[PDB]
Write a protein that binds this DNA or RNA. Sequence first.
DNA 1: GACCACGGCCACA
DNA 2: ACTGTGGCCGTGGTC
Length: 756
Amino acid sequence: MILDTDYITEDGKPVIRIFKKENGEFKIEYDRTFEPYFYALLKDDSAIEEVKKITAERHGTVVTVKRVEKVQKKFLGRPVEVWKLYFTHPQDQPAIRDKIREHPAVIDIYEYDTPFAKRYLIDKGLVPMEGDEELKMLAFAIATLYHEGEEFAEGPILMISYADEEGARVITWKNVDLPYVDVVSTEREMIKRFLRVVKEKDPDVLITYNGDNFDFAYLKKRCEKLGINFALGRDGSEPKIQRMGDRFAVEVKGRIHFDLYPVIRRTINLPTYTLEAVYEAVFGQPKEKVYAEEITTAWETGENLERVARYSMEDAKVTYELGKEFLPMEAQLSRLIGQSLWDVSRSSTGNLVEWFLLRKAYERNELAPNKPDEKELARRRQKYEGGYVKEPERGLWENIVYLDFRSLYPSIIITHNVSPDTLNREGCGEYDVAPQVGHRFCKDLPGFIPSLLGDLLEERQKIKKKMKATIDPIERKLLDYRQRLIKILANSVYGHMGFENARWYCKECAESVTAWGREYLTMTIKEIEEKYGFKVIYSDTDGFFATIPGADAETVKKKAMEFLKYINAKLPGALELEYEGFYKRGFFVTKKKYAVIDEEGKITTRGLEIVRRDWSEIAKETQARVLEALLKDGDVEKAVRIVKEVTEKLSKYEVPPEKLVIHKQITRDLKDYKATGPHVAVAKRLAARGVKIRPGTVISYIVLKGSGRIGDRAIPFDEFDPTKHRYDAEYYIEKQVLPAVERILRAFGYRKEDLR
DNA sequence: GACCACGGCCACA
DNA sequence: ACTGTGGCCGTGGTC
Ligand SMILES: O=S(=O)(O)C[C@@H](O)CN1CCOCC1
Ligand SMILES: [Mg+2]
Ligand SMILES: [Mg+2]
Ligand SMILES: [Mg+2]
Ligand SMILES: [Mg+2]
Ligand SMILES: [Mg+2]
Ligand code: NA
């Protein structure tokens, strides 16, 4: 199984290294054949000789074009001839390229900014994480001495915890009687022992939580102060750093550094992304927190160091189990995109589709379009219409059913050959014309995007079939991971066509797909009402909820099935509508907000404040309880009863303060904010106090009893003393709980005053 | 100073 | 920064 690729220079020539794991043995394949290149388009093939005589400078050594090759490729589905410019070293082409681009006889250069090892994986048709080879894993965490006002890593590393299949153990340079504690003399011996543990375990993946921005940087700073060689790589190298926009990420050559923070932030949405919070969310069991204050005090007084070690052991044991749950899926994503698990676990979704598309484009001899320049980016600042959300039939409905279009947008793209290369193509014999936008799509030849999406969705159906037949639960889940990810990728390819930074950006294709989908949904609505007698309560973009006014439950189900068959025949191509489920009752507040209950009793809430992270748990809990009473038993009397009980508890200040915390995120440099609301105000004060509030910082504030601007009255919950503070129950009643439960109970006549 | 437009944050598809 | 559609609220601007 391929794990990663990179390249090392040797006598000036590049050498690709393929880190594999075959038959349970770590192997390194060396290739000295691959040559760096990019494509260039000339007004006249004549100037190729003048293009051969181009110069530049790197490391005091002039860089020249090695050779040229005339290659014929298809750009935008159209034939074109292009010169392939070869170079001696990969780093030569980050130079020269701007010089070539500015040459008079060149039009543009293509596939220039492509990583050499990535280009190898693509051009060689190599797929990471392919095989039944199980991987050895090891999760490590650190515990450091923190003193305020000091620089980074001024204090020492107190403990180094690691966890694997055998268990969790902590290495520390002080005496603790905990059985999982190995005691050493100095921080140097602690680090040294950790490297020995890694070296002897030869781990394939190293699981860290936020290790890309802390654990490895702290370990590096200490290994430089104490004069250690942090040779954690299988090639005998130290963890290398690579920039990732504002922040950085660390690689362990010959291994895969799996930082769980970016993966978990992307996959799950929670109010706060603390390790303890992530654990109790994914596994249901709480994890105790020991703050740096307690840690430093315990180390300096030598008292209660056992508890600090327990935190370290857990911090690692949970990191392993979390990684064990999130690695197989991310490995299958790596298999799908054709890039290393390291890169896919840290890259944005819009960048993953670029890797996938560039692989496919190489498979189809399609010259990959470049990225948008600044002027075209502004030219791409255009807006098009999207889905059709109907003003919901607000209130409570009974015996209802949701019908959805399976992969609506992808089905449209394939059915009508929707793609930038099949748009207004002069000289075709078959054209499908897009509603409202009037864009003509050639169907004589299948398009790039439709071909990819077609092959993809074909695989997903195949994958689901093998899954339902597969007997190993592991293998099954692997297949289940692929089918879900295939669906995400397909719909993401549509977003690429609308992404300004995307290389295959066709606004026409986007608005055409939206228009088609609007049409298909509208007709379905008209037919299910006029021809079959239903009332559409709500519809967003790819489906709708509906029922027959005063209908028997089983009647709705049966009559619903009939409309599916009727509409599917009238539905062109693979555009199908399907029966997601039946719900006894459901409340619809407004667009993008509702909740329904299955016949078993499971409630699905969407958009309602119960799912929001920027809302007090007391409001979310209360709104949920109201929703349960109504959607389960209709005890509206109990619902208002619950509201009154909660409001009285808040009046008497008997509600746990943790349920009154509002979690909001800083999305930019506080310097550039233009509306200092409560959360950015709290952080701005924290900023002056010393704390660095950066993009992504989650602020957790509470409102203390007082008056005036909400901002100049909120404190971070880490600064809340129940003995010295009192929360503004009025705010948490007249601005949190009531303004949410009212929106639901307004349908039944109750007003805020009627709720105490 | 009462009312309202509105950054700004998050959610659904 | 997938995109688009959408609902909120604390805050200040505005007569
Ligand atoms: O049945 S509900 O839960 O009311 C609505 C969902 O089925 C809608 N889907 C669309 C596809 O992505 C997941 C959500
Ligand atoms: Mg390029
Ligand atoms: Mg190519
Ligand atoms: Mg047209
Ligand atoms: Mg195409
Ligand atoms: Mg059909
Ligand atoms: Na792209």
